[PDB]
Design a protein around this ligand. Structure first.
Ligand SMILES: O=C(O)[C@@]1(O)C[C@@H](O)[C@@H](O)[C@@H]([C@H](O)CO)O1
Lengths: 213, 216
């Protein structure tokens, strides 16, 4: 029914500028305030500002922390213009439907768009199979990429149970993550188990088979 | 305005009561409504609105969620807690400057569980590139507290160790950990015994997984 879709998030250099957009449908856009909220990885949510509805003259209000950012709208998309970007701005950015004429504000949120403020360059991952030297644990090591995110599936999603994909950790401007899968001894090495790694930022898709030593 | 959420963390047994507090520096009550929201947020997802205007359930939100309070003092109660309730919760002033509280991470307690530990030597493809990572997965354990040490021929190594921990699983309430020791190929090939050692509540002595490079 109601839909919000953030776009425009990517890797951006410090001191740089970016404009994020939020695509809306399923409600009368013109009657609603529209807010932007961010969240640095592993940190609290932070309201940034809103643009008001027609009845209140499409004016804007901002938080103390960014009053540097600018909000605007196409009457059905809403924008966030970000200037002089720095480290603290690195976050997932959300749009949310704010107050209209009674409906709860912040009931509807988009999926967010990831903003990464860094001088480090986009780098594809190296993918390494982790094979053992009743139930067997296999894994993949995804090393040396930038920026986030990368996604991992096993056997194209066919292996859904017993998967652990670990949060990425940054070291010297390169990310590392790993993923493990635990399968019955009857599936492997009898048949093949593959980790499927994707890094949309570098346009990388790698499928790595875990072959016995 | 300042919103002070406490506690920042709490653990509650399945089917018991979770009580989370939010105090405002000034009253957020108008002559009609108290402008306090409560959210639930799970890893990789936007926040979910549970409670609007302090005491009202958003449509479809289970009855176990309850909000109370007025003025400056508010409370989110969850009873009986479910396994899926493992999450971070936020209060927020739902008008004016729309200030979020700092958040509360809720753990759902479960029976103790020893980590399933697996060790992996460097892949032949990593070695070809001149690098060597030894990986250790410590999976599906409880409680959360765990310590891992790497040893190369009995000599502890910390430089080049990268650790990552998952959030509490939403379904089985366990935690998992990954520890990756990165070395150069030349150092790897200069040593034999490689050992992942884990200290956890479930054992009085380290849980050990090992391989010897020249037995490979
Ligand atoms: O700034 C406004 O347009 C607005 O109407 C937004 C509301 O959420 C609320 O904050 C209101 C007044 O501040 C009510 O006190 O201002």
């Amino acid at each position: 029914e109601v839909m919000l879709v953030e776009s425009g998030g990517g890797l951006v250099q410090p001191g740089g500028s970016l404009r994020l957009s939020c695509a809306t449908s399923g409600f009368t856009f013109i009657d609603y305030y529209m807010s932007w909220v961010r969240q640095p990885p592993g940190k609290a949510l932070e309201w940034l500002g809103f643009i008001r509805n027609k009845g209140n003259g499409y004016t804007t209000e901002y938080s103390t922390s960014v009053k540097r950012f600018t909000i605007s709208r196409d009457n059905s998309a809403v924008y966030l213009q970000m200037n002089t970007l720095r480290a603290e701005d690195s976050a997932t950015y959300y749009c949310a439907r704010d107050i209209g004429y009674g409906n709860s504000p912040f009931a509807y949120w988009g999926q967010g768009t990831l903003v990464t403020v860094s001088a480090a360059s986009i780098t594809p991952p190296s993918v390494y199979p982790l094979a053992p030297g009743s139930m067997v644990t296999l894994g993949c090591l995804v090393k040396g990429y930038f920026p986030e995110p990368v996604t991992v599936t096993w056997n194209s999603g066919s292996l859904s149970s017993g998967v652990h994909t670990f949060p990425a950790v940054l070291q010297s401007d390169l990310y590392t993550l790993s993923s493990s899968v635990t399968v019955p001894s009857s599936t492997w090495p009898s048949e093949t188990v593959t980790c499927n790694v994707a890094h949309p930022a570098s346009s990388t898709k790698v499928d790595k088979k875990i072959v016995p030593r | 305005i300042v919103l002070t959420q406490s506690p920042a963390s709490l653990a509650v047994s399945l089917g018991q009561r979770a009580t989370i507090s939010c105090r405002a520096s000034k009253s957020v009550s108008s002559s009609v409504n108290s402008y306090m929201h409560w959210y639930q947020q799970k890893p990789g997802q936007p926040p979910k609105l549970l409670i609007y205007l302090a005491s009202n359930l958003e449509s479809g939100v289970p009855a176990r969620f309850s909000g109370s309070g007025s003025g400056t003092d508010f409370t989110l109660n969850i009873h009986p807690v479910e396994e899926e309730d493992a999450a971070t919760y936020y209060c927020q002033h739902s008008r004016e400057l729309r200030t979020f509280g700092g958040g509360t991470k809720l753990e759902i307690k479960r029976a103790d569980a020893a980590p399933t530990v697996s060790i992996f030597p460097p892949s032949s493809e990593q070695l070809t590139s001149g690098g060597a990572s030894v990986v250790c997965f410590l999976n599906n354990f409880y409680p959360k507290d765990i310590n891992v040490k790497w040893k190369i021929d009995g000599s502890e190594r910390q430089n080049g160790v990268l650790n990552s921990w998952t959030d509490q699983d939403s379904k089985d309430s366990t935690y998992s950990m990954s520890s990756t020791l990165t070395l150069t190929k030349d150092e790897y090939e200069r040593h034999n015994s490689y050992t992942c050692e884990a200290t956890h509540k479930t054992s009085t002595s380290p849980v050990v997984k090992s391989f010897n490079r020249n037995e490979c």
